[PDB]
Design a protein around this nucleic acid. Sequence first.
RNA 1: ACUGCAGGGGAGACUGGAAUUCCUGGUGUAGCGGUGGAAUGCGCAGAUAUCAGGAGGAACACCGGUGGCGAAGGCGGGUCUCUGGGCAGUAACUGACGCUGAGGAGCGAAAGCGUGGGGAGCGAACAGGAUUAGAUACCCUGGUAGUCCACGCCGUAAACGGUGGGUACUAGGUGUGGGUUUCCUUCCUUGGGAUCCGUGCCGUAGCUAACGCAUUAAGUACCCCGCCUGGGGAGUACGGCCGCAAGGCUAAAACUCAAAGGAAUUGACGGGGGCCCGCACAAGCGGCGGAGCAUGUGGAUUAAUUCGAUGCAACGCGAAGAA
Lengths: 152, 117
Amino acid sequence: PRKGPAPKRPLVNDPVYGSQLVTQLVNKVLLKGKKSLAERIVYGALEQARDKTGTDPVITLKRALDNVKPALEVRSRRVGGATYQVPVEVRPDRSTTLALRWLVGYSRQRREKTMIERLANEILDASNGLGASVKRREDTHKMAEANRAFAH
Amino acid sequence: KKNVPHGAAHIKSTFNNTIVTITDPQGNVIAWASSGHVGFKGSRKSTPFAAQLAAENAARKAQDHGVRKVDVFVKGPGSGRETAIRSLQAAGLEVGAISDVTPQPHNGVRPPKRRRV
RNA sequence: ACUGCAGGGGAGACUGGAAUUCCUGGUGUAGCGGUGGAAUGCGCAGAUAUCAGGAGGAACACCGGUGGCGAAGGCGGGUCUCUGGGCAGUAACUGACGCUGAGGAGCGAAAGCGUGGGGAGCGAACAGGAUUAGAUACCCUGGUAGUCCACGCCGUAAACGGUGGGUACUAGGUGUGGGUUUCCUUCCUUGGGAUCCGUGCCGUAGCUAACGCAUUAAGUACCCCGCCUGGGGAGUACGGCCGCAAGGCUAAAACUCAAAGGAAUUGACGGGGGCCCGCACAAGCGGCGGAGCAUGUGGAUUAAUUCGAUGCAACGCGAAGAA
Ligand SMILES: [Mg+2]
Ligand SMILES: [Mg+2]
Ligand SMILES: [Mg+2]
Ligand SMILES: [Mg+2]
Ligand SMILES: [Mg+2]
Ligand SMILES: [Mg+2]
Ligand SMILES: [Mg+2]
Ligand SMILES: [Mg+2]
Ligand SMILES: [Mg+2]
Ligand SMILES: [Mg+2]
Ligand SMILES: [Mg+2]
Ligand SMILES: [Mg+2]
Ligand SMILES: [Mg+2]
Ligand SMILES: [Mg+2]
Ligand SMILES: [Mg+2]
Ligand SMILES: [Mg+2]
Ligand SMILES: [Mg+2]
Ligand SMILES: [Mg+2]
Ligand SMILES: [Mg+2]
Ligand SMILES: [Mg+2]
Ligand SMILES: [Mg+2]
Ligand SMILES: [Mg+2]
Ligand SMILES: [Mg+2]
Ligand SMILES: [Mg+2]
Ligand SMILES: [Mg+2]
Ligand SMILES: [Mg+2]
Ligand SMILES: [Mg+2]
Ligand SMILES: [Mg+2]
Ligand SMILES: [Mg+2]
Ligand SMILES: [Mg+2]
Ligand SMILES: [Mg+2]
Ligand SMILES: [Mg+2]
Ligand SMILES: [Mg+2]
Ligand SMILES: [Mg+2]
C-alpha cells in the first residue's frame, strides 16, 4: 500500500512433521477452503516420497526447494519509448514463496493421474534437479543474466 | 608476439559508446576491444556494464602481449569513464596515474544547432 | 585652453595558440556512427581509435561580471600605425555664441542583391531514414546558396527601457565604475567623510485604471519636435518617389461589425511544479469475454408486443412474483 508495509501473519508447525515448510506447502495446495483435503494430499505425497527414496521427506523437500529457489527476478519497467526488464535481487522469503508456487503449479499440470503422485514425482525430480520447476528457475536466471546492462 | 612492459590506456567514453585502446608509450596500438566489439549493440553500448566488459577484454588482450602497467587518459562526457578504470584495475593491471585530455577549443568551430526534441 | 584619468569606441597592417575537417605515413583490427528505440550512412579495398608531419578556413576558452565604451545599430586573441568622443581638476580665454528642429542629409542587426575571391565547421533549399492515419515537420544521416573577405546596393527588426530632446526642483537606504579632496593621515585603511560624472536594487511624498514608476520619474513645471482619434478591410489598392531585383516610403475608399481592447479578481483546466491518498497500480487469488441455460436491454417483428430507465450514475433496473 502507500502507508508502509502491512503486518504479515504467522504460521504454526505441522504436527506430523515439525516444520513450517509443509504448512506453507499445504497452504499453497489449499483450494476452496478444503484445508483437510490439502493436508491429505501433502501427507500422501510426502509418504510416497519417503517410500520411494528411503530418505527423510522434509529433507528431500528442503533439497528440492534449494534446487528451485531463484536469486534474481526480472521486474519490468518502462523508461522512454521502450520498456525493458530490470534484474533485481530476490529476498529469501519471497524466494521460498515463489519456489513453492512453482512446484505446486508445475505439478498440477504433470501427465499423471492423482495429485498425490503428481506432487511426489515433482518433488523428487526437483530434488534431483530435473523437473520443470528447476527449468523455471534456470530460465529465470538466464533472463536475469541476459539483462544485466539495465541494472540501474 | 610482442612484449611491451609499460603502456598507455586511452578511454574515450561518449554518450553513445566507449572505446578502450592500449598503446605503447610511443603511440602504437596494441589492443583496442570496444563496447560494440564485446557483444552489445544499440543503446546498450552506453551503459557502464558494457564499458567495464570492454575494459576487461582490452586489458586481458594486452596482458597477452605483455603489459603490466598502463597510464590512463580518459576523455568524453560518458558514464563508463570510471567503471572502465575500475575494470582495468581489477582485471590484472595497475594504473597509477590518471589524466583528463578532453579537447577544449578556445572558442573555435561552430557547434551543431540545439535539438528541439 | 591647460593638466590628468578610464575605456571590447573606430579603421588599417602584421601576427599567436587551442580545437574541428582533410591529406601523407606508422600501429592496429571489426566495427563505428546515431536514437526515446532504430534505420539511412561510413568501414572491412583497412574505418573508428592512437601517434608524427602538413594544408586550410573560421571563431577567439580562462580573464568575463550584474562590468566598460559607443548616438543608435553595435564592440573583447596580441602588437604596431592612424583616429573620434567622455569625465575630473584649474579658472586661463570668448561673452548668450543656447535649445529644438518641418523638410533634407548621414549612419543603420540579420536576411537579401551585383562583381571578384575564398570555403574548415555550420547549414535554408534538396535527398534518404525514422515516427505517423498521413508527416511537404519536429528526431537522424548527408547536403547547395549563405555564413567569411574586397568594393557597391538595399534601409528593414519585439531596431525595446515597447518610455523624443533640453532644463530646473522634490526624503532617504544600499551595491558597483571613473575622478578630486580635507579631516580621522595611518585610525595602512588604501578604510571613513565630502563633492562631481556614470550604472543597479529598495523605498517616502507624489502620480497611475491597475500593474507599477519613484532624483536614471511614468512626480512638479517650461521650451521645441514626432505621433493618436473604434475593430476589420489595410500599412492594402491606385498615383508617385527610390531600388538591379526583392521590395521600401507616402497612403485611401467602398463595404462590414457593436464591439475590438488594457489591467486585475474568482474559478476551471494543463501531455506545469510540490506534497498526500484510494484494490489506482505493483504482489497475489478467483473470475468475465468462448459453450448451454436463466434474466434484462437494443433491434427486428407483430393486432398489440403498454409505459418508464439509456456512459461511470440504464440494462436479475421500477417489477418483494405478468396463466
Ligand atoms: Mg576590413
Ligand atoms: Mg577539407
Ligand atoms: Mg591511416
Ligand atoms: Mg585517425
Ligand atoms: Mg571680459
Ligand atoms: Mg538638432
Ligand atoms: Mg525630420
Ligand atoms: Mg549606406
Ligand atoms: Mg549580411
Ligand atoms: Mg554575395
Ligand atoms: Mg537569389
Ligand atoms: Mg560569389
Ligand atoms: Mg550538419
Ligand atoms: Mg538537418
Ligand atoms: Mg524527406
Ligand atoms: Mg518600423
Ligand atoms: Mg537591439
Ligand atoms: Mg515604435
Ligand atoms: Mg530627456
Ligand atoms: Mg523629458
Ligand atoms: Mg551610486
Ligand atoms: Mg485612465
Ligand atoms: Mg522600484
Ligand atoms: Mg501614464
Ligand atoms: Mg506597400
Ligand atoms: Mg505603386
Ligand atoms: Mg489578462
Ligand atoms: Mg492547478
Ligand atoms: Mg494487479
Ligand atoms: Mg469466461
Ligand atoms: Mg458467455
Ligand atoms: Mg421495454
Ligand atoms: Mg449497471
Ligand atoms: Mg443488481
